[PDB]
Amino acid sequence: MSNLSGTDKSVILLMTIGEDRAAEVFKHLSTREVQALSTAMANVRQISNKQLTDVLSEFEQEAEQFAALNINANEYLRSVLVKALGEERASSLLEDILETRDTTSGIETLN
Amino acid sequence: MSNLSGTDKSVILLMTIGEDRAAEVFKHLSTREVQALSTAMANVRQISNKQLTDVLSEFEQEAEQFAALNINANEYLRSVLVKALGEERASSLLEDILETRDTTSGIETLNFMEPQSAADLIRDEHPQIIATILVHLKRSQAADILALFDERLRHDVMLRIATFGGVQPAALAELTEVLNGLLDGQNLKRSKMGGVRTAAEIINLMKTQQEEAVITAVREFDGELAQKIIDEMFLFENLVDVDDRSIQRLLQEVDSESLLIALKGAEPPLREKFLRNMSQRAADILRDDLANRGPVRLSQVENEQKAILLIVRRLAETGEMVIGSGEDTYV
Amino acid sequence: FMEPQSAADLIRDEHPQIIATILVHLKRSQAADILALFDERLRHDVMLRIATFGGVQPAALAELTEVLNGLLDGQNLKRSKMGGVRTAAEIINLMKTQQEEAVITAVREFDGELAQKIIDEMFLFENLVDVDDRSIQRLLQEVDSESLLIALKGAEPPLREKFLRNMSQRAADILRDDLANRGPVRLSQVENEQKAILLIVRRLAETGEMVIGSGEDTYV
Amino acid sequence: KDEQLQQRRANQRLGAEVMSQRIREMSDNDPRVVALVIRQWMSNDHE
Amino acid sequence: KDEQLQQRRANQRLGAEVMSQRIREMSDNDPRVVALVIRQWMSNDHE
Amino acid sequence: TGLVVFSPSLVFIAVDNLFGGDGRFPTKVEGREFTHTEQRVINRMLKLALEGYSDAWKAINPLEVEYVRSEMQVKFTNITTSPNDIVVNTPFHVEIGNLTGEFNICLPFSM
């Protein structure tokens, strides 16, 4: 069991899944993590078959133990709010929801 | 078990595999390691049969134990990023990724950094020094830098390039260390974020009077800049949302050959949008022409597209047709 | 192993017999190059001494060798050949047409042969396959059949097919039969015909009948 | 011994390919789930 | 003894040739793998 | 303190020969400061000159020669207490092939 960093292991998983699947997994990722994983797969070292197998086995375990729900986490928001309070109050609440997530820099405050 | 150094053992493997395989293995090797193995395959001694067998056995063990993945490690970047964020952001992230691996010498920093600042740096240097630095860099960078020097110095520099005779090793080492010290300033990385294709996008948004005043000022400042900005203003994509009546009107003004050339580069949705509006005979002959005529150069396709964009702009100025960002919702 | 010019500088002051002795030991090309650098009188004297060499004493040659070892004890000479021609031209191929035409004009003014070599390295007999079909059709109207036949012998099979597939079937067939039938032709003659047709290509591109562009014409 | 080692390697790679088809399957089913699992991995990288 | 030694040498060279064909096969299959294996060798030369 | 004067033509020729130029090109001295690489070349042949000068002097009087610094303008140096102070200058004309240069040795008469 070599010292396989989890970022490199996630790189390996992104390699094994495939192109469109990798892009889909990317689309649910934040920009900083995207750059981190891009640099990791830039300086990626080739992996042995046994370490590959260990990484894929533990990843399958994690996916099996953690897979559930995440059905409509964002659009369910809007549909429930619209069917509940109508379009204007649904939009007000949704704007409050999306603005609760703070900027990191004052530039986005300007936005 | 003789003291067989691993570099010599790798030379043994390279000799045994074969010439094509040796070159293929080389192609995935760095230059310094290539020269090290080159010195090894230069001073290579003979290897006995038993040592040969031991080296090949342990190499087979290593290959079997560590062989995996290495499928598309590099092009996986480009394919994932393109299918994810599109070509422009894919290229931006890819450039960041390829720049993450640092240079060892400031010479390659000169290659990676802006040609204008490079010309500023090298203008006072000795013309032979200019030649020596220029030959090192990537050819695009050298050409760009030479485009910035005045005629006389550029003349002397190119002539020195052609009549180059050879720099001394101590001379080049001192030049390299001087450049490393000068470029030791932490990072240059002039952030390319923003510019054209954002200016026009913004001008697309505000009031018509404001954007027309802005584009008039941009035309006064630089006509070519304004034309580029306007070409980015329109973009050959809203022709599918500029709805059916505009298509019918523009057919009365577009030449058949220009439409045929333009539709070759047009997307199938846009081609269907243009085709489904007019008569069955016209649609059929246009589709047959599109499927029959051979490929046409992108330059010609964009020329016809620009002509018909001029036609669209001229008709929108007359007000016969509506170009609106807001989608026409139908109930 | 080191540069003939610096060798001539080193050996010019030495005794003519010493010059002959040193020249004997070196590789023939190095000795010839060094002799090409000496003036007529000293070169003639050294050549006559080479012809009339009688034999150096062992102690004499040992002292000469140790003196040369001491003089050349300077760590490494290895004048890096990196860069020069075939680098300058592919430099000039990139920047603006006005800049590079000023380039070739200034290079020609400084030295005509250098400019001609630089231009021959500019064009290179490879972009004739990316200068697309219409240029091939136009250049057939200007190239002589014998010159084309001689040039195509050294041309690559892709370039030969590119030139052949554009014109009439009869012309392509007779050209292919001539290429397969005629015996081998000297590389000098092949490059002479290639240079003539490169002159024709340049003269037609100057008139603007053909487009020679590095950017590949993408087809959709 | 060589045949045993090579057949062991073949079995290992075949099983890896099979479950890699499995991973492809779940990834194309619920890409959000795998994205959040690698989110967990990135989060737990730091301890 | 001479015949035994010569046949032992013949068997050794035949086995070496056979696995050398094997090495040629893997090298033409995945040259990146062998390139990075000799990368490993160059890296571990220094310890 | 003494002075060593290295002429622009001499430094130009030295750098040209050192860095690949065969020197066949005409010498174009328009007037400019010496770059850091040119400064290193200056340092090298200056070290050689000082060693040779010390060797030459040792036959008469042994002395120690030490580099102080380099300057571009005569106002930078002011080698004497007054400009009217009597000083010794020794010129040397160096020829290599067809390229000519000069370098001077300036020692105050008080030295």
Side-chain angles (χ1 to χ4, degrees), chain C residues 30 49 86 117 149 164 173 201 209:
Chain C
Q30 192 88 355
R49 289 173 190 275
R86 189 178 181 271
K117 292 172 184 166
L149 175 58
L164 280 164
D173 286 334
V201 172
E209 288 184 81

Side-chain angles (χ1 to χ4, degrees), chain C residues 63-132:
Chain C
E63 277 173 23
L64 163 73
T65 298
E66 69 183 2
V67 168
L68 265 294
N69 265 335
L71 196 149
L72 277 300
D73 200 4
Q75 296 294 321
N76 176 297
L77 315 176
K78 191 64 178 175
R79 190 171 183 177
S80 170
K81 185 57 58 163
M82 171 295 268
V85 65
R86 189 178 181 271
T87 299
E90 190 276 331
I91 284 173
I92 300 160
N93 282 313
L94 285 190
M95 73 291 291
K96 150 82 191 164
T97 311
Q98 188 273 331
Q99 300 186 327
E100 60 193 301
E101 75 206 12
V103 161
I104 64 184
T105 307
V107 173
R108 188 176 293 149
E109 182 179 1
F110 189 82
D111 200 345
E113 58 86 20
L114 197 66
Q116 187 50 50
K117 292 172 184 166
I118 283 170
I119 294 163
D120 206 0
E121 195 57 87
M122 301 295 268
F123 189 80
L124 184 63
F125 209 71
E126 302 308 313
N127 55 7
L128 272 190
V129 76
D130 300 326
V131 76
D132 64 358

Side-chain angles (χ1 to χ4, degrees), chain A residues 4-18:
Chain A
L4 264 182
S5 67
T7 313
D8 183 33
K9 302 195 286 181
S10 304
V11 162
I12 295 157
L13 312 167
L14 268 284
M15 295 299 102
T16 53
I17 49 177

